[PDB]
Amino acid sequence: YSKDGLPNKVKTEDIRIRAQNFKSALANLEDIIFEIEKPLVVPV
Amino acid sequence: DRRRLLGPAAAKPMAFEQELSLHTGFIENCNGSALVEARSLGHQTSLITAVYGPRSIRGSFTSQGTISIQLKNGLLEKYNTNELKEVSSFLMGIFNSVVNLSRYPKSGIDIFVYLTYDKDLSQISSLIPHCITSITLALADAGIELVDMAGAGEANGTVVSFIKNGEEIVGFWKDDGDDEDLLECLDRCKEQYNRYRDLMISCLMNQ
Amino acid sequence: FQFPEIAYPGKLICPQYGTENKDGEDIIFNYVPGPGTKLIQYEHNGRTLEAITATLVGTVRCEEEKNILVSVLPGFANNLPKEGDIVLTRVTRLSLQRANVEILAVEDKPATFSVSQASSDLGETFRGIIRSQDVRSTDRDRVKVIECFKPGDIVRAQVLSLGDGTNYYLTTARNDLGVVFARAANGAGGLMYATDWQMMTSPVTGATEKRKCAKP
Amino acid sequence: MSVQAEIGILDHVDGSSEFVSQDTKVICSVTGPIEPKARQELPTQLALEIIVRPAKGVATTREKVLEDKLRAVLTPLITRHCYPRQLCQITCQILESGEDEAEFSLRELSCCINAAFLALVDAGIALNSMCASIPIAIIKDTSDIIVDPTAEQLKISLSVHTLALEFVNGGKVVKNVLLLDSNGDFNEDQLFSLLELGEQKCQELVTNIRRIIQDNISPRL
Amino acid sequence: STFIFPGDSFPVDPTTPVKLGPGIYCDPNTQEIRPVNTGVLHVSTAYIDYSSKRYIPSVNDFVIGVIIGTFSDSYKVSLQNFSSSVSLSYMAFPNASKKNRPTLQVGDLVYARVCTAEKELEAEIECFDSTTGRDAGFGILEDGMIIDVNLNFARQLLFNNDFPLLKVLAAHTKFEVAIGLNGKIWVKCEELSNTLACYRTIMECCQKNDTAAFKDIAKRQFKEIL
Amino acid sequence: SLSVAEKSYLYDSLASTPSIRPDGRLPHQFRPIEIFTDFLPSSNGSSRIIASDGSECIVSIKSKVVDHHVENELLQVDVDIAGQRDDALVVETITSLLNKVLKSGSGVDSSKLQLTKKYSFKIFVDVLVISSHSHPVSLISFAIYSALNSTYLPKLISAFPTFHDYDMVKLDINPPLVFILAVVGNNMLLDPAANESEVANNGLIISWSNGKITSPIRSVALNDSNVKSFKPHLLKQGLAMVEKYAPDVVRSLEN
Amino acid sequence: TISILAAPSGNYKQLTLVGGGAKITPEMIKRSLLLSRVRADDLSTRFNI
Amino acid sequence: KDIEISASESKFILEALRQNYRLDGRSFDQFRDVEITFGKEFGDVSVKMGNTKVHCRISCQIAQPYEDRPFEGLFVISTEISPMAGSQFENGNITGEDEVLCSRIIEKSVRRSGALDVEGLCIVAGSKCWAVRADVHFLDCDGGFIDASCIAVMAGLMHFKKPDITVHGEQIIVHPVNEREPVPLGILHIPICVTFSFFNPQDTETNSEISIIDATLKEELLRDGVLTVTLNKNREVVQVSKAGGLPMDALTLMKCCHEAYSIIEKITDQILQLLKEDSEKRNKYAAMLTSEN
RNA sequence: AAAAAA
Ligand SMILES: [Mg+2]
């Protein structure tokens, strides 16, 4: 339903690319990188 | 009744060319489903069959599968519950020969057949070949291994189910009618079987 | 293959035995039933006959392994936990000497998985038990089960023996096996990720709980 | 809206309470944490067994709705992750209808909520916050909003309502609405006017409830 | 007194480190400290005292349990009705043995302490403290009589030595007593009339709940049997 | 509950061309039974049948008065099997089957129960199965048959309600019989034993009225395992088998 | 969850709101009642019944 | 779920009964003091015996009588036990041994004893009549289910008053409570049940039996025999139910009837008194409200 | 569905 309140049939292709976008994004997850302070370690 | 809403108990109820339509796999609640609609003369029948399984039974030591069939009244309350159990027992005597039970050890297959709409312008004898058609479709759609396609026909109240291309019989239902119709009913139902068989096979391939 | 490609349930595919003539010698093709097929008996000309008959609607596949295997592939059921397979499970309850779970999905072979659909509020789902000795190869004798698994945590394991017809026996001894997905405080907190093999941390609330983690 | 309540009227139960509002009187009881049945076991959270019986006859589908609505309120209240794989039996028995039980069940619902929460307190269960429920109705003619009406006021009422809010910080700040039931003909303007008077009266019973606990719990300690 | 309600703001500042305890809950996500019960907040240590008739397994707690089952691995002991069972190992007894097992039938009263108690795991008790001379009254309780009371009356009786119960009962009669933190009190005397006199007192004292009414009840109870 | 070693033995024995039964019976032989009748004074008719395996069925016949214009079914058969529910699958199946066997427009004359043009006798048939080691459909059938042969009702006085205070009417009718058959291999069998049905490939339920085969006729699965399809010639053979050996059993149960 | 029974006339019948996982802001009620009005007005006249 | 009882308790209570002592400090022939409180509405009644707390509510509706008895009325009792009385009782269990027993005992005390007139509950013969229902709510379980439910039902029926009905042709009309006063149900006699508990201790072995009246929850689990006798002020036995248990002489049976008659007579005069005090309580309140008009 | 002697 749009702003006017009129029913709009969602295309059968619309949901297809939604699955293509989801399956592609879920297959390769971005590696979560977080750093922790280590005052006990020293360089060479 | 504390289970459902039956309303006032002091009240009383109201007092007053073969064509087929096959559809399968329209229910996502189960493993296999089927819709069968037949219209002939002044009598049409629409029923739905759902198949849930095969699902594992805990502690079961059965080396083969276990089939359970139950018929239900969807809308019109006509057939007696006692008679529904009888047909169910007849139907299970059929598919226990049809279904390859050796494939599902320690498992069980539940079959629900909903009798939705039946117009009539014995009695339940005519619906039997449609119940067999529905179940055989729902089982084949579900993935259950069937040794052969089960089908039947109704001739003068005499129902007989065939497999292996009508060469053998997996079920026989004779009620009322008359005598000496043995050879005739076997030939008339065999034509209905072959007709129902090809439409069933075509139904599974097309969709 | 001189045999029908498409097969509905009840359709004749090929007889019991077969043979052909090549290189001046008779080659014997041995037809054996498979998933989707069933060897049954037919009668014709007053004489018995045995032939491979498909029981499921689909395409016929004739393959050979180092004999001709005849099977029918549909357009789940065949997939069942067998010794050596990898299975994703969920912890249902924790005891002191063991840890019982329930089987959700099973890893396929060359990742892809086979999800077993069942009702978790009934008990129809396959149940499995992970022994305390099968937790890790390191120190098999003394293992604290509380510091390894947790109710609700997802555990990737491998089935050793089926045992009886009730519970499956799994193990998380190797590196690629252990708790995969888990949350803080039995699922009340935020998501946690696997860092060390024996330590699971959460890069959100800074919470750290002791689990048995697998290798990324 | 003068009410009355008691705490710990039952012996063999872990916690109990007796709520009184107008004519509707609903006594509640709570046992837990105890050993759960195999079918009720929840590996992480805490299981809730809720039972609501009427004043006359046997529990029907009507009471099944009362149990379902009561469950929605007590669920977020109790910290389920404190008692993994355990059981809590909550039974609410209605002693008197206090209304027309055939046409209206929203008066008894609020009382079942109030009595249950008090029993949860007495039984010593982990609660995230506090709660209070009041029955509301709107007369067709006067078109006024009445908080905690009577039996005769419901018969001529156009629409009936039920409000249950969650309270934090000394029973002042409202975290979230737990339950909001409404039945009958009403518009949107009457709805926001219902919460305006409801939230005020709810907090009035919250602070009223709080002092009831103090008078009963403190002498035990 | 300072009365506390669930969901209310916590008076104690989050700046200074404060050790947790029973009565308060640490939110696994928002990391805020909130009260979950109703009672009086005691700050020395932070915990909340609330009225409860149901006991929960906790480390270092003295409990009186009843053997409801005998297995090969351990004992099944119920510290309270309808509650989950507790695991009492065979090695949890003084002078333990391998092949030889301690003699305990179904229904025998045992006075033990809870060693390991996890929320998501079956609790465990041991019939020998860890440790206080191995004899704090631990072991089988022969004969006598037990009484069910609330948890508030049980803990104050065992811990607080200013509680005028063991003080007032010792003057009326000479007896040995064992008190569990699960609301169970086991008292054994010589004559049965004395045990009955002790049962009726605690039954009335727990009901009325008055510190200065102990001597009054005990006087009229012991003179009633005669 | 037989072992596979027993089932494989009994099958190879029954499926053989000179079919050997475990008890030596020929394919048309019936096991010796025992029928007691008229042992219930409170009921209009009664019967009791003991079988070889220890199966037992008690059938009671009672009646009342009602308008036959408002009641289409003047014959109600109720089946109660010991240790079984009233809504059980097998119970309600037999309950529905026997009602088709004994019906006003099937195998029972409706004019026999006709007293006047307004009122008629409605017969209530009750069935109590004490012990059942097999399908009692044939056992119950022989019990209801002997129960209707020996029946006594209040004798009418007027014509076309009042009854005779002493003298009584003896209902003389031809009650239907139900013979269960077993299909093992290519051979047909009459009166299947307990252990025979567990290995039988299929089965037949055939009725009988007035020296002729009649409805209902069903094809029941005696088990759930070795159930297989059968050739049409077996149905023609089975029906003919019942046809020729029925005057023998009827003649026996007549005495 | 939020359950609404809206009528084409503009009024309402059944209103069920239960928050168990998050706070329920009044702006979401107005958003729910707005979406329920159009949903009910669409189902009122669709198949011309 | 089952109640776990220690071996020490079982030995203590049994030995105490041999010394004529019990936990609640009572006698063997003594019955627990019963207090009866009526609610606002008529028919609502609360009965309490020591720690045992029950509740009863009498209702009524217009229904049709059975075809077997068209000249009679309808009566039914609900004794369903909720877990409120304890976790020992399951939810929705009518197949309970002691539960169906309590239901039948109080049913035989009301119906088959001719206590309540079902013929006077018949509006139209073979058409419509009154249907009196009594729902027993078991609040707290300290024992004495049969006894407490027996008083609650009886006291409720005598305190209950059905709306006056006038027959107009085939139409049945109902008069409001403000226009006309409700007519009380007719009770010929008041039956009251007394529950006995038998014990057979060891040691001090030829002849030894212990019988107490109205046992508590702890005493009810240790008893070897159960006996329930129902008596009234009319010097007659309403009903008596002894199923198995410890075998007893016929003399000891009538010995328990004599001890019970002194108990039922005392509380029946208490019920009639509390009915009298409550009847005049509503009378003085009705006159005060009118005087301020 | 552990148990007894040494
Ligand atoms: Mg039966």
**Token output for B52:** 């849930």
Residue F126 Cα, gap to closest chain B Cα (Å)? 16
Query: Which CATH number does the domain housing residue H103 bear?
Result: 3.30.230.70
d(CA C156, CA F22): 56
CATH class entry, domain B1-207: alpha beta
d(CA H220, CA B130): 62
Q: Which residue of C has its CA nearest to E32?
A: C205
Contacts of residues C179-182 at CB distance under 8 Å and 24 or more positions apart, as own/partner, are C179/C148, C179/C149, C179/C150, C179/C153, C179/C154, C179/C155, C179/C211, C179/C212, C179/C213, C179/C214, C180/C88, C180/C154, C180/C155, C180/C156, C180/C214, C181/C153, C181/C154, C182/C150, C182/C152, C182/C153, C182/C154, C182/C209, C182/C211
Strands D145-147 and F153-156 come out as unpaired
Give the residue numbers spanning the domain of H116. 1-293
Query: Which CATH number does the domain housing residue C18 bear?
Result: 2.40.50.880
The domain tally of chain C equals 2
Cis? peptide before B54, omega within 30° of 0: yes
Kind and range of the H or E element at B83? helix B81-98
d(CA C170, CA C166): 13
d(CA E15, CA D213): 31
Q: Are C99 and C179 contacting, i.e. CB atoms less than 8 angstroms apart?
A: no
Cis? peptide before D33, omega within 30° of 0: yes
Q: Are F60 and F45 contacting, i.e. CB atoms less than 8 angstroms apart?
A: yes
Compute, in angstroms, the gap from residue F130 CA to the centroid of ligand 1.
10
Q: Vertex H196, ends H193 and H201: CA angle to 5°? A: 175
Strands (E), chain B: 19-24, 32-40, 43-56, 66-73, 107-120, 151-155, 158-163, 168-174
d(CA H99, CA H84): 15
The domain tally of chain H equals 1
Q: Are C90 and C102 contacting, i.e. CB atoms less than 8 angstroms apart?
A: yes
Query: Which CATH number does the domain housing residue C174 bear?
Result: 2.40.50.140
Number of Cβ atoms within 10 Å of the Cβ of F160: 9
Instruction: Tell whether C29 and C133 lie within a shared domain.
Output: no
Instruction: Tell whether C137 and C50 lie within a shared domain.
Output: no
Find chain G residues with C-beta within 8 A of D184's C-beta.
13
d(CA F205, CA F182): 9
Instruction: Tell whether C150 and C87 lie within a shared domain.
Output: yes
Q: Which residue of E has its CA nearest to D221?
A: E152
Q: Which CATH number does the domain E1-52 belong to among 3.40.50.300, 3.50.7.10, 1.20.1740.10, 2.40.50.100?
A: 2.40.50.100
| DSSP SS3 for E22 | coil
Return the amino acid letter for F210. Answer: N
E-facing residues of C in 156-215 (CB < 8 A) are 184-186, 188-190, 205, 207
Q: Which nucleotide lies closest to E100 by the C1' atom and the CA atom?
A: I3
Q: Nucleic chain I: which protein residues 10-39 of E have CB below 7 A from it?
A: none
Compute, in angstroms, the gap from residue F144 CA to the centroid of ligand 1.
18
CB-neighbour burial class of residue B51 (10 A; exposed 0-12, middle 13-18, buried 19+): buried
| DSSP SS3 for H264 | helix
Over its C-alpha atoms, chain H yields an Rg (Å, rounded) of: 21
Domain boundary among C75, C99, C124: C75
Per-domain boundaries in chain B: 1-207
Look at residues D37, D108, D39, D102 and name the one whose alpha carbon lies nearest to residue D67. Answer: D108
Q: Which residue of B has its CA nearest to F204?
A: B172
Q: Which CATH number does the domain F1-255 belong to among 2.30.30.90, 2.40.30.10, 3.30.230.70, 3.40.50.2300?
A: 3.30.230.70
Q: Which CATH number does the domain E53-143 belong to among 2.40.50.140, 3.90.1300.10, 3.40.710.10, 1.20.1510.10?
A: 2.40.50.140
Give the residue numbers spanning the domain of C216. 76-216
How were these coordinates obtained? X-ray
Instruction: Tell whether C98 and C168 lie within a shared domain.
Output: yes
Cis? peptide before H83, omega within 30° of 0: no
Which one of F72, F181, F204, F219 makes the best mutation probe of the B interface by having the most chain B beta carbons within 10 Å?
F219
In this complex, whether C and G touch, counting 3 or more CB pairs under 8 angstroms, is no
Look at residues H115, H119, H263 and name the one whose alpha carbon lies nearest to residue H191. Answer: H115
Return the amino acid letter for C79. Answer: N
D197 touches chain H (CB under 8 A): no
Burial per residue of A2-16, b for 16 or more beta-carbon CB atoms within 10 angstroms, e otherwise: eeeeeeeeeeeeeee
Burial per residue of E29-42, b for 16 or more beta-carbon CB atoms within 10 angstroms, e otherwise: eeeebbbbbbbebe
What is the stated resolution of the deposited model, in angstroms? 3.3
D130-139 β-sheet, strand order = D145-147, D130-139, D157-168, D173-186, G12-17, G2-6
Q: Are C106 and C144 contacting, i.e. CB atoms less than 8 angstroms apart?
A: no
* DSSP secondary structure of H12-61: HHHHHHHTT--TT---SS--PPEEEEE-SSTT-EEEEETTEEEEEEEEEE
D129 touches chain H (CB under 8 A): no
Strands B107-120 and B66-73 come out as parallel
Query: Which CATH number does the domain housing residue D208 bear?
Result: 3.30.230.70
Find chain E residues with C-beta within 8 A of H15's C-beta.
192
Ion ligand 1 neighbours, Cβ < 5 Å: F 80, 84
Chains that touch D (3 or more CB pairs under 8 A): B, C, E, G, H
Q: Which of D126, D169, D171 is opposite residue E36, by nearest beta carbon?
A: D126
| DSSP SS3 for H136 | strand
- Interface contact flag, C186 E122, Cβ < 8 Å: no
Give the residue numbers spanning the domain of D23. 1-221
Domain boundary among C59, C75, C91: C75
Q: Are B97 and B122 contacting, i.e. CB atoms less than 8 angstroms apart?
A: no
d(CA B47, CA B117): 7
> Stated in angstroms, how far is E106 CA from I2 C1'?
15
Compute, in angstroms, the gap from residue F59 CA to the centroid of ligand 1.
14
> Stated in angstroms, how far is E122 CA from I5 C1'?
37
Q: Are H164 and H175 contacting, i.e. CB atoms less than 8 angstroms apart?
A: yes
Q: Are C145 and C91 contacting, i.e. CB atoms less than 8 angstroms apart?
A: no
Strands C25-32 and C68-73 come out as parallel
Does domain E144-226 match CATH 3.40.50.1980? no
> Which 3-state string (H, E, C) describes chain D?
CCEEEEECCCCCCCEEEEEEECCEEEEEEEEEEECCCCCCCCCCCCEEEEEEECCCCCCCHHHHHHHHHHHHHHHHHECHHHCCCCEEEEEEEEEECCCCCCCCCHHHHHHHHHHHHHHHHHHCCCECCEEEEEEEEEECCCCCEEECCCHHHHHCEEEEEEEEEEEEHHHHEEEEEEEEEEEEEECHHHHHHHHHHHHHHHHHHHHHHHHHHHHHHHHHC
State whether the Cα torsion D144-D148-D154-D158 is positive or negative. Answer: positive
Q: What are phi and psi of F157, to 5 degrees?
A: -120, -55
> Stated in angstroms, how far is E22 CA from I4 C1'?
49
Burial per residue of F40-70, b for 16 or more beta-carbon CB atoms within 10 angstroms, e otherwise: beebbbbbbbbbeeebbbbbbbbbeeeebee
Instruction: Tell whether C58 and C100 lie within a shared domain.
Output: no
Kind and range of the H or E element at A15? helix A14-27
E103 touches strand I (CB under 7 A): no
Residue D48: partners with Cβ closer than 8 Å, 6 or more residues away: D71, D74, D75, D78, D88, D90
